[PDB]
Amino acid sequence: ENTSENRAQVAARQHNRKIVEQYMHTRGEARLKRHLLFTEDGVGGLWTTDSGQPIAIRGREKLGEHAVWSLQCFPDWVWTDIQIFETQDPNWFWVECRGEGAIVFPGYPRGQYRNHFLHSFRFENGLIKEQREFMNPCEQFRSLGIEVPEVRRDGLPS
């Protein structure tokens, strides 16, 4: 049905999608301003870590400081194979994509890092309130020269 309430939802979903698209195409020095797409109290970060706890970055200002670190450590990062998923909630989107670039973490040799990622984007008033990324930390270990633990799966059918 074409009601003003359904129309508002569509508008919201369209606006929010544009921001997800912008986020995912943000490269290079533009990364230093990606925080501006967040609410003042917005949270972003990595939900799949070796420690098992997220690295959550809280607040628009913190996100901007994190961007300085990220550009140092991932100096040429690009996201590719981007698929955006709208949901039944006009303020919640998922993205499946890959990423590749140099990895330059102190205490390790410089490497080439590739991973598969899922991102969650939740919105409030047209700005991102919570962004979360999910990847396989094992692929990061490989990029850093870190031995990847191996699980034997005995009897796993063929």
Minimum distance between the CB of residue 54 and ligand 3OC, rounded to whole angstroms? 9
Determine the Cα angle at 138 with ends 31 and 148, to 5°.
Answer: 140
Under the binding rule (CB under 8 A), the answer on residue 4 touching a second copy is: no
Residue 21 has phi, psi (to 5 degrees) of: -60, -45
Neighbour count for residue 119 (Cβ, 10 Å):
22
CB of 110: closest distance to ligand 3OC in angstroms? 14
Draw the binding track, 100-139, toward a second copy (x: CB under 8 A; -: no contact).
Answer: -----xxx--------x-x-x-------------x-xxxx
Give the residue from 24, 151, 147 showing the smallest Cα distance to 85. Answer: 24
Check: CB of residue 103 under 8 Å from CB of residue 110: yes
Q: Is 40 in the site for a second copy (CB under 8 A)?
A: no
Give the interface size with a second copy as a residue count (CB under 8 A): 50
Q: How many angstroms separate the CA atoms of 127 and 67, rounded?
A: 18
**Which chain residues interact with a second copy by CB under 8 A?**
47-52, 55, 57, 62, 65-66, 68-69, 72-73, 85-89, 92, 94, 96, 105-107, 116, 118, 120, 134, 136-142, 144, 146-157
